Design a protein around this ligand. Sequence first.
Ligand SMILES: Cc1cc2nc3c(=O)[nH]c(=O)nc-3n(C[C@@H](O)[C@H](O)[C@H](O)COP(=O)(O)OP(=O)(O)OC[C@H]3O[C@H](n4cnc5c(N)ncnc54)[C@@H](O)[C@H]3O)c2cc1C
Ligand SMILES: Cc1cc2nc3c(=O)[nH]c(=O)nc-3n(C[C@@H](O)[C@H](O)[C@H](O)COP(=O)(O)OP(=O)(O)OC[C@H]3O[C@H](n4cnc5c(N)ncnc54)[C@@H](O)[C@H]3O)c2cc1C
Lengths: 489, 482
Amino acid sequence: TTDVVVVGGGPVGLMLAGELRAGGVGALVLEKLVEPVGHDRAGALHIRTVETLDLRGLLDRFLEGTQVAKGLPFAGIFTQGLDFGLVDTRHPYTGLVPQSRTEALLAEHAREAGAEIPRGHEVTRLRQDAEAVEVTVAGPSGPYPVRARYGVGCDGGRSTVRRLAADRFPGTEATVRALIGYVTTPEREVPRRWERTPDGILVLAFPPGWSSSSTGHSDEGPVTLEDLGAAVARVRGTPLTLTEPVSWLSRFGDASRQAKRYRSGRVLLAGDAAHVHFPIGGQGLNTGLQDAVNLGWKLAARVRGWGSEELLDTYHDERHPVAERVLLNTRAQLALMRPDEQHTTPLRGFVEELLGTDEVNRYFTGMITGTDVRYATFAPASARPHPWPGRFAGGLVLSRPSGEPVPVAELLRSARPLLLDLAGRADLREATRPWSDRVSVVAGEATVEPPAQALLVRPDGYVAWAGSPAATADELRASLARWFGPPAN
Amino acid sequence: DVVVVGGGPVGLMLAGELRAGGVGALVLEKLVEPVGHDRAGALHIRTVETLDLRGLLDRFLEGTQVAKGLPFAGIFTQGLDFGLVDTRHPYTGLVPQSRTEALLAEHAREAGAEIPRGHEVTRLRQDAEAVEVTVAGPSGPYPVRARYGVGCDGGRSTVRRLAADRFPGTEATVRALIGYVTTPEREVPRRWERTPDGILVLAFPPGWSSSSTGHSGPVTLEDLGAAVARVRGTPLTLTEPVSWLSRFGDASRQAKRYRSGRVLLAGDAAHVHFPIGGQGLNTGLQDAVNLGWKLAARVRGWGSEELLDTYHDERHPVAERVLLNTRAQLALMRPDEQHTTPLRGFVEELLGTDEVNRYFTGMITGTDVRYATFAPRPHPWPGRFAGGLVLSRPSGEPVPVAELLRSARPLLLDLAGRADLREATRPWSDRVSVVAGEATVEPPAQALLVRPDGYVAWAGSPAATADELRASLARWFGPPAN
Ligand SMILES: Cc1cc2nc3c(=O)[nH]c(=O)nc-3n(C[C@@H](O)[C@H](O)[C@H](O)COP(=O)(O)OP(=O)(O)OC[C@H]3O[C@H](n4cnc5c(N)ncnc54)[C@@H](O)[C@H]3O)c2cc1C
Ligand SMILES: Cc1cc2nc3c(=O)[nH]c(=O)nc-3n(C[C@@H](O)[C@H](O)[C@H](O)COP(=O)(O)OP(=O)(O)OC[C@H]3O[C@H](n4cnc5c(N)ncnc54)[C@@H](O)[C@H]3O)c2cc1C
């Protein structure tokens, strides 16, 4: 009676709302807070994310803010930063876009897309039936129930929705404290502006923003200014700090927890509600948005009819393995940034040396920026899959008449699966007539590397099925029926 | 002639190289009955390659070496693959240090070097022409004069003390107790490394080792049981007669100068590190071979002062890195499940990469060592190791350059055909010119002035004139004949 209800007006939530509308489904976002607050957590959108935004024509809107970094760094190692030039991408850079500004854009997009955004409605409880779900809400006018076919949790890390459906979501206890907060130019008139990793902690100051991580800290009331000064026990000179009017200033730990199932019947999880990690390398919102886009088109499909149950299960099948690795890279990154001068500095030396290597630099570059993600869904047996299944195609360019460059990124904005003819294969095209909602665009791309004559491309940029010369129409027939349900009458 | 202090491996080796170099060698060893037992050894490729240059390799292969090769920092899934590095000997010699000393001693005995076992050194004194060491023998004290004195004792080298060299380094914060014991309790435990939270243990028979991170008289058996606080089940242990059993720390100290006038340092007397990856004796023996021929030369006349200075210039940078790799290795070896396990995962993944596996493989086994001495740009072969090349020429018979260096003399390999260079090398004494063909030469090379230690001193591309080589010889091996 109200299609799909997403809980949380965060980035992930707004994104998911857009993809649901772009997918022809009613979206409803209930956001706890009333006046959005990003401030801290100042954001940074990496390549795979940026590439993804291009598939939605949203990239143009984010480039008014001067992104940059081509790119680096990694675990406080600056001498040999991550070089984006080593990975195949049409967008070899990161969008330095403050999360506050990001939410602003995503909200505006969902508003115009036709999705209600009541800001100021916390969710008290839930209840999952066999056909639909009901969420108890607490609005200014007062409480009220709400029915919808599916409910997705896109709130914070303390997701109530995760609680109310019981999902754990194990993870590790925090042993790293990190206090941050903006406080411009109090004492000293031009200290320093380096990261610096003393013995006892690692600080990061800036004047004409302070950040301090302590390793080995597990009753506490909210965090105070004087709380931050002593936290700078890592430095000799004791600025602390001072005032200097306060701004935001928060505290963060290195608990690495993650939902054991992204799905529980007809409840789903995304963004921080599904994975929680230390804020190192700015992978949080990146992983979230991509979770959203991966689910959006899949869920919208399930609702409208063609989206099968198997299809929805793949959301977790694909996105869980990804976040696992994020939690791990952040935990290992912390090991590399450890405040030990006796073993860890030596190690950092060697590691910096390997970041000089293209092979290894490309590796960590891929891990962080997301370019390394490839899915493994709906593989046959016995008949090994093509080299293109799961690979990302959102960054290809086509041509054909006149030799005009035609970005596949622009063709996915329709939010519909594609079939790229690349070479010339009409047998496959004709086998795809019965669709609705898959379009067949004909072109001619030489790469195709490894070679490929056809690419069944998902709404999210990733390839679902790929065709070599030997691929018959009958093979593709089944691949469509499985990915996008039965043909027309 | 020359007095080396210490009947350890390094000391015995150095003795041999001095005799092979035509100089009198005298080894004074503190202890009377040699004791290796613990520290069970392992000789890696560059070392093995080095032993081949001395025809000693044949004698060490009666014991079944092995490992082709691995592991690395307790990471077994993806061990170091020796097959990725260019070498005629892609393996490590699993030769117990006790057995090793046995061989090296026997070799020096027959080479003509006195080995009085049971003569500690009380003090020293360095003149302008010679050095005198005060000794404490069974018959009683006595002074001893020699042109040069090399310290090849333990890590607590008195010789290092008596010449004042520091030798900074870091304080130990890692305790490691080891000791042979069986079958103390249980007839069914395990045989894995295992890295718990709190420490990392390593048990065996049906051989105990326990490292604790965060600990700053003599060590007892009951001392070892509690050290196994890292494990739940408390074997501890028990007795089961004892055997050796010692304690070791991770202090990473190293001499600030391998040379002080006419005193020299080698082996543990020059570098000290945690026993991880068995790089201790390896680095030592190579120190010895690098010094041996250089020092023997200085004594006999042709060995210049500049030449002897290069011993430190070359060998110091090497041990620095060893200390560092061991310290970083310890960082990789836990005992943190919260950050360090995750890191080990990624690192294991990179050890799957050939490029990276080749890297760590080179670092450990020594294959990555290349010197940078007497540069004018230099050829691609200066400093590179040549001891593993094969020659041919008539009949097409394989002729290992390893076999030609046993004479302990510098060589000049003609490879291609360059007589202008040969004729320019007639005046020597003690450099020999062997003619042969080798297509590799990779990067290409027509001539290779090879040091007694396997490493290339000077290399020749077609453009290299006789005049260039002329100077290169005069600098490396002193003036020509009359
Ligand atoms: C210091 C720091 C620096 C960071 N830097 C980067 C970076 O550079 N690049 C990058 O990509 N990521 C970065 N991150 C990641 C970070 O921004 C988060 O991971 C990201 O905001 C998560 O997306 P989300 O929408 O799911 O979370 P949120 O934004 O927290 O979603 C919260 C929303 O749902 C909330 N909510 C909670 N409970 C309910 C309920 N019961 N009912 C209704 N609503 C509810 C609402 O309050 C709401 O505003 C950083 C994080 C930190 C702490
Ligand atoms: C548990 C353990 C395991 C190891 N495993 C390996 C491995 O697998 N591979 C590897 O390459 N290395 C390994 N090592 C390193 C180890 O073998 C040393 O590097 C080697 O013993 C040092 O050689 P050395 O001769 O210079 O010192 P030593 O062997 O200690 O020689 C010292 C000798 O001179 C001593 N001496 C001291 N003072 C005097 C004096 N005043 N007068 C006369 N003599 C004196 C005598 O005691 C004497 O026996 C290991 C070390 C330990 C502790």
